[PDB]
Amino acid sequence: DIAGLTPCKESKQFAKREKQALKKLQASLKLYADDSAPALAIKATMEKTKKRFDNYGKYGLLCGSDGLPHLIVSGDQRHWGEFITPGILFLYIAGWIGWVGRSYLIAIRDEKKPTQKEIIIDVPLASSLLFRGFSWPVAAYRELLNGELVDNNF
Amino acid sequence: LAEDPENLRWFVQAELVNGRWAMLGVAGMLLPEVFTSIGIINVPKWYAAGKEEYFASSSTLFVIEFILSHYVEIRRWQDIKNPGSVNQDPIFKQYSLPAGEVGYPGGIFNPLNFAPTLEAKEKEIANGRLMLAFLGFIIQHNVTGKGPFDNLLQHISDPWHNTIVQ
Amino acid sequence: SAPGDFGFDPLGLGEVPANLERYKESELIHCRWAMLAVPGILVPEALGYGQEWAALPGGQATYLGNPVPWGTLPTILAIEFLAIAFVEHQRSMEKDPEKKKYPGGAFDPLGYSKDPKKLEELKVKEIKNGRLALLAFVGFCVQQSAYPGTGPLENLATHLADPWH
Amino acid sequence: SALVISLSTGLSLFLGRFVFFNFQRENVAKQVPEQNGLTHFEAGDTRAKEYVSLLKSNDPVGFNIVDVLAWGSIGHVVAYYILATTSNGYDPAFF
Numbered sequence: 037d038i039a040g041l042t043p044c045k046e047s048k049q050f051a052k053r054e055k056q057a058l059k060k061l062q063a064s065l066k067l068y069a070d071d072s073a074p075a076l077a078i079k080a081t082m083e084k085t086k087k088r089f090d091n092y093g094k095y096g097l098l099c100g101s102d103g104l105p106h107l108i109v110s111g112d113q114r115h116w117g118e119f120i121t122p123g124i125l126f127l128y129i130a131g132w133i134g135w136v137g138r139s140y141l142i143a144i145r146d147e148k149k150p151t152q153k154e155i156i157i158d159v160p161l162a163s164s165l166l167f168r169g170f171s172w173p174v175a176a177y178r179e180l181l182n183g184e185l186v187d188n189n190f
Numbered sequence: 191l192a193e194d195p196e197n198l199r200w201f202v203q204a205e206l207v208n209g210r211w212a213m214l215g216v217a218g219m220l221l222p223e224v225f226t227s228i229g230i231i232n233v234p235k236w237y238a239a240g241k242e243e244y245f246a247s248s249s250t251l252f253v254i255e256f257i258l259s260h261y262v263e264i265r266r267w268q269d270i271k272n273p274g275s276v277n278q279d280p281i282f283k284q285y286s287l288p289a290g291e292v293g294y295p296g297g298i299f300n301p302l303n304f305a306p307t308l309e310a311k312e313k314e315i316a317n318g319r320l321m322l323a324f325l326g327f328i329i330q331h332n333v334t335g336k337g338p339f340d341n342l343l344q345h346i347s348d349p350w351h352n353t354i355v356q
Numbered sequence: 357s358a359p360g361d362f363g364f365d366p367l368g369l370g371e372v373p374a375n376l377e378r379y380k381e382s383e384l385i386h387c388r389w390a391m392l393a394v395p396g397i398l399v400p401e402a403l404g405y406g407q408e409w410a411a412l413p414g415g416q417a418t419y420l421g422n423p424v425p426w427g428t429l430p431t432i433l434a435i436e437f438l439a440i441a442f443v444e445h446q447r448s449m450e451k452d453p454e455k456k457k458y459p460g461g462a463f464d465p466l467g468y469s470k471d472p473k474k475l476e477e478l479k480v481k482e483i484k485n486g487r488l489a490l491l492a493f494v495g496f497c498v499q500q501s502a503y504p505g506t507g508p509l510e511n512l513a514t515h516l517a518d519p520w521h
Numbered sequence: 522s523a524l525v526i527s528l529s530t531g532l533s534l535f536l537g538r539f540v541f542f543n544f545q546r547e548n549v550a551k552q553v554p555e556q557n558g559l560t561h562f563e564a565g566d567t568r569a570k571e572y573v574s575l576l577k578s579n580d581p582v583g584f585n586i587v588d589v590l591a592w593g594s595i596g597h598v599v600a601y602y603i604l605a606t607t608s609n610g611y612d613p614a615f616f
């Protein structure tokens with residue numbers, strides 16, 4: 037809707053892309069597997085990109101010209117989860133990479149000398165620490181701002 | 191430099207507030223349930239009231255209730271930093287003024303107390319989780335369908351269903 | 357929230373309490389000149405009949421010789437600013453604590469001198485009525501600034517609108 | 522529409538606030554002192570700022586705007602004329 041022309045429901049330019057291209061990759065008249073059991077353009081690789089179809093999902097999806105899709109990601113119409121849905125996802129996953137970065141680290145410096153523990157890795161992935169990360173509700177999001185890492189630790 | 195078990199007034203309060211509202215939410219269903227009666231999101235516009243006026247948009251009923259809700263809600267944040275509620279029932283709860291043991295910082299496990307009566311709401315705590323994570327389930331199962339149970343001569347088996355779309 | 361509770365002296369205190377605020381107080385009655393064109397509406401079934409110089413149908417006399425550029429608005433205006441600018445000057449210059457000269461020797465002791473030349477003298481109730489005024493011009497007057505064509509011919513059923521807008 | 526001489530009226534509001542002091546008190550520019558030759562030395566490098574000298578004119582020369590601005594701009598200004606003009610003078614109204 038926002039400029040790049042509209043979704044699947046009609047994107048001719050998009051249609052023409054579906055067709056030539058793949059459909060021709062077809063257009064090797066045959067090359068022969070009349071029984072034959074191996075060679076897989078034939079089945080899917082097309083059909084897996086091809087039984088892509090007046091359906092794709094549906095997905096809206098903007099299709100500029102040449103009918104390749106453009107992603108607006110505004111908070112509108114159809115398009116919201118082309119950044120946020122897979123955006124908070126990126127955030128959540130990272131940060132539970134480094135929440136445990138700031139963990140199978142702040143667990144040593146200690147006892148009897150710890151000068152390169154780090155290059156062998158008891159327990160690997162920390163693991164133990166690991167799950168801390170999904171079991172963050174809130175986690176750093178208040179504790180980083182108060183106490184522990186605290187302005188004094190600042 | 192101080193090692194552990196900080197938290198204090200803190201968010202014991204948060205959970206319990208979840209438990210108490212979760213319990214209420216479940217009551218908001220509850221309603222049909224024996225006379226199967228009415229279902230699901232409903233989006234109701236709630237109970238009604240009976241008509242002279244409406245057609246009903248009639249403004250944003252929620253926005254208003256909610257501005258009011260809002261200085262009850264402050265009252266509580268207040269209390270929690272420095273406390274005054276005559277009953278004094280979450281912060282400790284009743285039996286009140288003590289919880290001293292939390293107030294000066296540092297408890298680490300503590301169980302707690304409450305009420306001039308007795309039986310320590312450890313039994314309200316349960317009735318209270320279940321209702322936590324009961325929404326959890328309840329909300330989850332919409333996506334697909336309204337209803338649970340009663341009878342088998344057919345129902346219990348879950349003989350054919352939808353899936354997720356993929 | 358200009359204040360929650362910031363703070364400390366002579367400017368916030370000094371320029372800011374006293375005077376921003378006495379100068380906001382000079383404000384409400386003066387707001388009232390404006391609210392006042394408006395009260396002039398404001399009572400129903402009053403008998404305006406008909407001047408009051410609204411909507412530019414032509415002249416103040418006209419004048420003998422031309423009308424001045426075009427219209428009233430500039431005459432009233434130019435003139436008002438020099439007169440009032442003179443008064444903002446009368447506000448300008450005393451001190452409080454005492455005023456003999458451009459005198460050289462009065463810093464503070466303990467304790468503790470003079471309060472904002474005027475401090476409130478009590479009948480800081482004027483202020484409940486005052487804040488309340490700042491709040492209303494703000495907000496409510498704004499409550500119909502925004503799309504404001506029409507006077508009431510009030511319908512039914514209730515009130516408010518929400519989105520919009 | 523456009524009150525063009527709304528504002529040229531306007532700007533020689535202020536620079537007549539310039540016709541100022543050349544005339545009155547003392548020799549002019551209050552000196553030079555500092556400008557050629559140069560400053561003590563000074564050497565921050567340096568002075569002079571006073572927040573207090575807004576008084577003197579703001580009341581006296583408030584009038585100046587008017588003098589062309591009034592009756593002289595949109596005046597038929599200096600109508601009260603004639604005064605040696607064979608080669609020519611007038612100067613006749615463009616109004």
Ligand SMILES: CC1=C(/C=C/C(C)=C/C=C/C(C)=C\C=C\C=C(C)\C=C\C=C(C)\C=C\C2=C(C)CCCC2(C)C)C(C)(C)CCC1
Nearest residue numbers: 109119120123130131132133134135136137138176177180
């Ligand atoms: C809505 C939106 C938007 C907006 C934006 C903005 C407005 C910006 C900004 C932002 C910002 C303003 C940022 C900053 C912040 C600050 C800070 C300060 C942060 C922080 C943090 C930290 C510190 C972290 C840490 C960590 C973690 C958490 C993980 C692990 C560990 C670590 C260490 C890594 C965008 C654009 C996106 C686009 C569209 C959408």
